[PDB]
Amino acid sequence: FSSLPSYAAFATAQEAYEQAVANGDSEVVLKKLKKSLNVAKSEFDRDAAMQRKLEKMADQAMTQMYKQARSEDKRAKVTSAMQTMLFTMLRKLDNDALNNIINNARDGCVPLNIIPLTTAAKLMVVIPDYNTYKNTCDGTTFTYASALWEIQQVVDADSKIVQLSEISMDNSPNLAWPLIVTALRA
Amino acid sequence: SSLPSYAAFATAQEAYEQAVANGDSEVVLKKLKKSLNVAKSEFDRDAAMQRKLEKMADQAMTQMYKQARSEDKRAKVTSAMQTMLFTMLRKLDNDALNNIINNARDGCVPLNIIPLTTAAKLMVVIPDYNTYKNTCDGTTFTYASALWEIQQVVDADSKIVQLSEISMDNSPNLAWPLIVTALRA
Amino acid sequence: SKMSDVKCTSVVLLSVLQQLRVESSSKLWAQCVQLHNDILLAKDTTEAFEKMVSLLSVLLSMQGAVDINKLCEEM
Amino acid sequence: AVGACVLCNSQTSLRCGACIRRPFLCCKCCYDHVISTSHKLVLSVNPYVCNAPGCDVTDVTQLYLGGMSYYCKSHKPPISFPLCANGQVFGLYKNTCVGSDNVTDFNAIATCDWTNAGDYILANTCTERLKLFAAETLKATEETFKLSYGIATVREVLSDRELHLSWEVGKPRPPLNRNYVFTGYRVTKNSKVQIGEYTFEKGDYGDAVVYRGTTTYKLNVGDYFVLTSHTVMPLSAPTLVPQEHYVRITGLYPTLNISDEFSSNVANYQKVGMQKYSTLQGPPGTGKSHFAIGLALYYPSARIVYTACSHAAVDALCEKALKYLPIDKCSRIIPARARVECFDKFKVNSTLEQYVFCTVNALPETTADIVVFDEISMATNYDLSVVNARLRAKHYVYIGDPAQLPAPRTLLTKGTLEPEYFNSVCRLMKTIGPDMFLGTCRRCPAEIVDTVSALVYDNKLKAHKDKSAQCFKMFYKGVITHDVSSAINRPQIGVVREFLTRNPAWRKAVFISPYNSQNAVASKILGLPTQTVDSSQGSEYDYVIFTQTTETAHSCNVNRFNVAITRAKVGILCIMSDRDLYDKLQFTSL
RNA sequence: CCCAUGUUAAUAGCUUCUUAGGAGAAUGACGUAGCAUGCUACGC
RNA sequence: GCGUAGCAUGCUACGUCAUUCUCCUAAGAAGCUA
Numbered sequence A: 001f002s003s004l005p006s007y008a009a010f011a012t013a014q015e016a017y018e019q020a021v022a023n024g025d026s027e028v029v030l031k032k033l034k035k036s037l038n039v040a041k042s043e044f045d046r047d048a049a050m051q052r053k054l055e056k057m058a059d060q061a062m063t064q065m066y067k068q069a070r071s072e073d074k075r076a077k078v079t080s081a082m083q084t085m086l087f088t089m090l091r092k093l094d095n096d097a098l099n100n101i102i103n104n105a106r107d108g109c110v111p112l113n114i115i116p117l118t119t120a121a122k123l124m125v126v127i128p129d130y131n132t133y134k135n136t137c138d139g140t141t142f143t144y145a146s147a148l149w150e151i152q153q154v155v156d157a158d159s160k161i162v163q164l165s166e167i168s169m170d171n172s173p174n175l176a177w178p179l180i181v182t183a184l185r186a
Numbered sequence B: 001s002s003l004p005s006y007a008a009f010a011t012a013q014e015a016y017e018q019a020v021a022n023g024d025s026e027v028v029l030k031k032l033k034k035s036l037n038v039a040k041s042e043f044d045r046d047a048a049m050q051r052k053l054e055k056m057a058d059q060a061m062t063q064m065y066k067q068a069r070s071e072d073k074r075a076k077v078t079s080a081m082q083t084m085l086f087t088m089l090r091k092l093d094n095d096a097l098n099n100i101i102n103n104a105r106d107g108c109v110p111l112n113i114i115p116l117t118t119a120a121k122l123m124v125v126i127p128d129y130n131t132y133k134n135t136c137d138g139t140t141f142t143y144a145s146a147l148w149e150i151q152q153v154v155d156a157d158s159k160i161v162q163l164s165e166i167s168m169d170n171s172p173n174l175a176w177p178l179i180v181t182a183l184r185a
Numbered sequence C: 001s002k003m004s005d006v007k008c009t010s011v012v013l014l015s016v017l018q019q020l021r022v023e024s025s026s027k028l029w030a031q032c033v034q035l036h037n038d039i040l041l042a043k044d045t046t047e048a049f050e051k052m053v054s055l056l057s058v059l060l061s062m063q064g065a066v067d068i069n070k071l072c073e074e075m
Numbered sequence D: 001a002v003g004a005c006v007l008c009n010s011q012t013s014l015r016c017g018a019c020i021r022r023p024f025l026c027c028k029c030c031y032d033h034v035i036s037t038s039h040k041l042v043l044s045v046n047p048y049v050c051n052a053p054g055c056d057v058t059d060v061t062q063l064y065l066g067g068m069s070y071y072c073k074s075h076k077p078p079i080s081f082p083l084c085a086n087g088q089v090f091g092l093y094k095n096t097c098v099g100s101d102n103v104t105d106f107n108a109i110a111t112c113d114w115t116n117a118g119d120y121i122l123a124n125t126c127t128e129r130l131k132l133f134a135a136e137t138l139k140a141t142e143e144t145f146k147l148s149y150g151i152a153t154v155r156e157v158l159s160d161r162e163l164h165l166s167w168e169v170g171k172p173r174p175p176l177n178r179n180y181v182f183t184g185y186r187v188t189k190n191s192k193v194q195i196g197e198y199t200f201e202k203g204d205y206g207d208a209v210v211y212r213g214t215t216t217y218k219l220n221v222g223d224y225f226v227l228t229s230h231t232v233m234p235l236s237a238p239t240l241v242p243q244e245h246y247v248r249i250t251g252l253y254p255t256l257n258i259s260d261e262f263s264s265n266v267a268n269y270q271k272v273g274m275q276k277y278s279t280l281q282g283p284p285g286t287g288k289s290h291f292a293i294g295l296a297l298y299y300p301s302a303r304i305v306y307t308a309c310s311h312a313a314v315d316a317l318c319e320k321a322l323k324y325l326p327i328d329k330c331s332r333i334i335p336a337r338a339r340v341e342c343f344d345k346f347k348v349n350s351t352l353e354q355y356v357f358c359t360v361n362a363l364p365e366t367t368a369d370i371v372v373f374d375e376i377s378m379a380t381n382y383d384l385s386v387v388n389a390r391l392r393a394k395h396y397v398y399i400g401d402p403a404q405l406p407a408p409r410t411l412l413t414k415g416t417l418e419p420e421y422f423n424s425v426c427r428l429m430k431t432i433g434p435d436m437f438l439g440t441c442r443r444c445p446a447e448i449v450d451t452v453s454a455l456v457y458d459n460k461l462k463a464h465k466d467k468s469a470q471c472f473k474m475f476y477k478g479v480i481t482h483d484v485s486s487a488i489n490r491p492q493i494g495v496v497r498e499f500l501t502r503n504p505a506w507r508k509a510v511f512i513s514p515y516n517s518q519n520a521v522a523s524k525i526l527g528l529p530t531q532t533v534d535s536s537q538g539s540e541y542d543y544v545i546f547t548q549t550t551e552t553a554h555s556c557n558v559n560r561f562n563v564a565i566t567r568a569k570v571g572i573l574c575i576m577s578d579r580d581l582y583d584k585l586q587f588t589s590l
Numbered sequence E: 001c002c003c004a005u006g007u008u009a010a011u012a013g014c015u016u017c018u019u020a021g022g023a024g025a026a027u028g029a030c031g032u033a034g035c036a037u038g039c040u041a042c043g044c
Numbered sequence F: 001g002c003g004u005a006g007c008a009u010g011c012u013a014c015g016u017c018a019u020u021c022u023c024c025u026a027a028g029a030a031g032c033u034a
């Protein structure tokens, strides 16, 4: 607006109007100068409101461009995170037993519920009280899913390690149940 | 509203009011109407600018106050909650809560949860002989406005101690703080 | 108001215990939660006060976590 | 960003702008501070600069508030009102504020350049929040004085452990010791990048500056060195936690049959139990640092943090604990940087042990049950504030003596600081008297006590020893050479070298000289362990070889001399420089 | 002419409030063009 | 009587400025219900 020539035209028309007010020309000339000042002010109004609308729109387009760039960068970051998650879960497979059971299926499909039950190497048993502990995994080896498991650790609900010499009927009150016994496939 | 545009609108309004009080005529009357109108519209544009500015100032005051008070409240949350709790505990004026608090000031705190059942076990540490004298008598033990029967008094060196050793004179030979295991009557 | 000041002091007292990280000790947090829920569903003020004694005695049991001689001083 | 006014603790939002620490100030106090001094810049939640497009007016007496910004006199909108008006600079919480009168002291604290003698006596008899602010601004001044030192540039690399340095022209040389770490640069076109944290020491032969470094980089010609400056952390905790005389002992459980050695100290242990903080004052070698271990052995269930400002004071405490206390339940804390080597026999950096040991600057935020701050003469109110911010505990025992030598106070050059201004606690021991007092020299031979109970402590010491006939003090002038600022005296090292072939039992003696550089340079002629007088405070030795280097105001300081000669357990050789002091003591002539 | 130090929170509905954008309307005011008639200065 | 010029008043169109209303959308805070 200010750098536009319309501002210069309005400013010089205002200067001419002040000079004619101080100069006392004829009333028809004064009406003429008021007319020229008014059309200069109308052109200034048009161009200045035009540039204000223009710069509002340009700032809007810049803001939406920022939003698009942020969305696309976050999409790239989420695709990277999903891909690395899938590839770590690939490296965590137990490929010998998994290949054995998949090649033992007549179609190549096995239900998902028996993928861990025949290929997992670690069994986590969660035990709520002592009678359950006595019945499911008494001693340092036990049986579940037709294999034999060897107890490698027992933690309590507080993630504290609990020795197997602790879990007795008289020390059952002082343990923070449930107990999470982690066993390995023998 | 006392603005420069209000000075201009004021002098234009005064001139038009006086000239219409005379009310003579006619072309200068229209000229004065036009001058008053344009000055008034300039004033109203400026008053709109003032209203927008004061509305933005008002939102700034409100938002700054909300941010300051909210972050101050979320900072002192532990101390405010503890002070509130002990205010409420003093307001209840219960005679058991007062007793366990007035013991816990001195140092006679329990080592487990106080039980509710008849004949269950409570282990409270007693730090000094005078705190023993205030709570124990013979073998009864008055705690939490309940009577408890002492079973067993151990020392800080975990040696058992008989209740006849606890004397006004033998107490410097003890190994404080005692741990009293008692059972609810 | 005497019943409904113990029902609110349980709320404040369990908030204090939770801020002192009681809940990292699961056997203790189970009993504190059970005492809290038993006070809130109580119709007789005597049993509410006994459960409040048992619950507060968890807070007094931990030595340096609070400063009881400073908090009680102002009252 | 609201806060509390320093000198009346009202709520406020202003901060003085010319003060180095930006102290929060209430409205009336900020007007008093900006109407008297020349500190005319104020910051609110936003600064009080003129928000013209281009204008530089910051003087708060000039600005006006208009719209939502602060404009100078020549850009104000007609809806505006002055800030610095009515006696109150406008900030938040304007009408809930209490004026004060200490603005005749806060100005002097915040304005002075800390060089005269009076500024430290004003920084130590004001109120507590002003004590913290004065300590903080003193630390900041001492930090920004280090920017006035010169800048180094390599001329050549004589050897991989021998640089050659040229310093900036017109700017004073820093002193070369392991306190002052430098950073390297290779800034030419091409990598204006730090190339390692180095530290220097002036090698004996030539103008060689033997440098130690963190990294393993080869140094070129163009590599140049800038001193590092540490930002001062703001401080909050009071210098002295308020005392509360208890009725009976709390938190501490005494012991049955403590020992036969600490049997005469039992009353002071009960006094430590009864109070909140207690202060112990004794002349040197009279059981003060021993008393702390006796406090360990009288309250065995009490977790203790021992602290001091040096590292040799805390190492003397560490040795005494090694002799007495169980070594499994003890510790020691060393900072990660650690330009100096410390005592390494405890399980280092395990703060959970029952008996922690530390320097006051490197304390971890923990609790205790009684905390022992040894050597309070070497402590400033910054140090006591830090030990009160980190360590939360039930009892405090401040041990030390004012007549030993203080914190150095590098800025202080015009005047002398009496003991009762060293910090708050030394003031307390020289205002109302110490809570516990033990004077009887159980360490030094009676000759040392006979000459040191006439200089400082006016005939108040008797020793549990006799004249041990191994106290020799000679008078040799010692023509000096000058290092950076720490002079070095070759012929006195010469006479000491003569006193090492001709006295064989003394080859375990420790060298003591008032200057750090001579302490480094007499290791390469003699080979004895070396210790400076300022850092020797609190640890004793069997035989001590002291060498007065120069006749000045520093090495002829009687407190420095006292802490120099009261460390010899059985024998001492003192190569003097001043005539009167050599006549003041009464040794053998030699 | 100098000495000590670096610590987990779903789907959906309704409602209140605040802010921003746009459109439309309504009124008022200014300016430009066009028209209606009147008046006046000139020519016929 | 007409044409030209100017002035007044009224209407219509367009450009702008303020006030009010309605709505549509966006964003946020909150409450209740299953």
Ligand SMILES: Nc1ncnc2c1ncn2[C@@H]1O[C@H](COP(=O)(O)OP(=O)(O)O)[C@@H](O)[C@H]1O
Binding pocket: D261, D262, D264, D283, D284, D285, D286, D287, D288, D289, D290, D291, D316, D442, D443, D538, D539, D540
């Ligand atoms: N009760 C005592 N009886 C005999 N000798 C003691 C006694 N207490 C301390 N000492 C000896 O006096 C010396 C004082 O050492 P220290 O406590 O470090 O003094 P300071 O604190 O003044 O440095 C110790 O070396 C110790 O051997």
Ligand SMILES: [Mg+2]
Binding pocket: D285, D288, D289, D290, D538, D539
């Ligand atoms: Mg000592």
Ligand SMILES: [Zn+2]
Binding pocket: D016, D017, D018, D019, D033, D039, D110
């Ligand atoms: Zn200032």
Ligand SMILES: [Zn+2]
Binding pocket: D005, D006, D007, D008, D009, D010, D025, D026, D027, D028, D029, D030, D098, D099, D100
């Ligand atoms: Zn103030």
Ligand SMILES: [Zn+2]
Binding pocket: D050, D051, D052, D054, D055, D056, D057, D071, D072, D073, D074, D075
């Ligand atoms: Zn300006």
